């Protein structure tokens, strides 16, 4: 089943953010150098690239329904570009500190940004990118934000304060706070996308990945094996696997039922920072960004 092939890999400066376009065979990379690139990974030709800033751009997503990309950087700013024309649609200071993570609501015109300023902010692009809410309560850098795809009126924030908080849009306190026991903090949080399990997953500098039942708050499993900071861990949308990546230079694929490692890949680009899975499992594509570039893999 698992038959991993390299679709396209290219070298670049450190890739901190990465995302797939849902209908074009494109991947967006956002770099530590302030540059962002959109690649057609089937033709292996650049669609568009932009020197956005001189600071790191840690976060970037497509907003395909608007033909946009949205990026956030260490200069504190969110910028949005039309990927067909190159037009800079908006450019604003979002936080008084680094932006770590951006999430886009699946149907409503909302973007979340998580920041070193200890907050998550909600922006509405149908209201001139107005700040509609600030979510306060975390006590260290907010490293990752993610909507619950099964109920995107709620979202999770993962924080170096060692917690995940789950929030409701329009409400000022978390529905709950998970104490992860990941004492070096949480770098990443993700939701299992299918209706049969209320699961989330967290990755930490403490070398662990943990699976959580968000209804009971129980830790279902702890996945050990990475040898340095775990940058991310995600559930694949269609295959029964979890995919993680680490500053140890490896991607790991784990069985999502037994939680045992199935495959370890060192693709030779040094530290791994970010991950994307194709929205619809097209060719079972995944992509990861590293110190020295990115790779797009077909898993089977």
């Amino acid at each position: 089943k698992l038959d991993i092939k390299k679709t396209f890999s290219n070298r670049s400066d450190r890739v901190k953010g990465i995302d797939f376009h849902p209908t074009e065979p494109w991947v967006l990379t956002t770099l530590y150098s302030g540059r962002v690139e959109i690649w057609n990974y089937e033709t292996q030709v650049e669609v568009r690239s932009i020197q956005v800033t001189e600071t790191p751009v840690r976060a970037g997503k497509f907003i395909a329904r608007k033909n946009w990309i949205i990026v956030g950087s260490d200069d504190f700013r969110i910028r949005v570009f039309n990927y067909n024309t190159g037009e800079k649609v908006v450019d604003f200071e979002a936080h008084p500190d680094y932006i770590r993570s951006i999430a886009v609501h699946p149907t409503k015109p909302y973007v979340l940004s998580g920041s070193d300023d200890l907050t998550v902010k909600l922006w509405n692009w149908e209201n001139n990118w107005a700040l509609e809410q600030t979510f306060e309560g975390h006590e260290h850098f907010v490293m990752c934000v993610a909507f619950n795809p099964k109920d995107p009126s709620t979202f999770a924030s993962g924080c170096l304060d060692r917690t995940v908080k789950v929030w409701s849009l329009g409400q000022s306190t978390p529905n709950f706070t998970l104490t992860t026991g990941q004492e070096r903090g949480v770098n990443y949080v993700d939701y299992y996308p299918l209706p049969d399990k209320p699961y989330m997953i967290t990755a930490s500098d403490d070398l662990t990945i943990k699976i959580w039942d968000y209804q009971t708050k129980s830790c279902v499993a702890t996945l050990e094996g990475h040898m340095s900071n775990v940058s991310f861990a995600v559930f694949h949308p269609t295959l029964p696997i979890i995919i993680s990546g680490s500053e140890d230079g490896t991607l790991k694929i784990w069985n999502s039922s037994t939680y045992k490692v199935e495959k370890t890949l060192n693709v030779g680009l040094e530290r791994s920072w970010c991950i994307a899975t194709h929205p619809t499992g097209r060719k079972n594509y995944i992509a990861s960004g590293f110190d020295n570039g990115f790779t797009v893999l077909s898993l089977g």
Binding site: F141, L160, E247, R271
Partner: peptide, 5 residues
């Protein structure tokens, strides 16, 4: 600044 990388 922690997590500068």
């Amino acid at each position: 600044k922690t997590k500068l990388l």
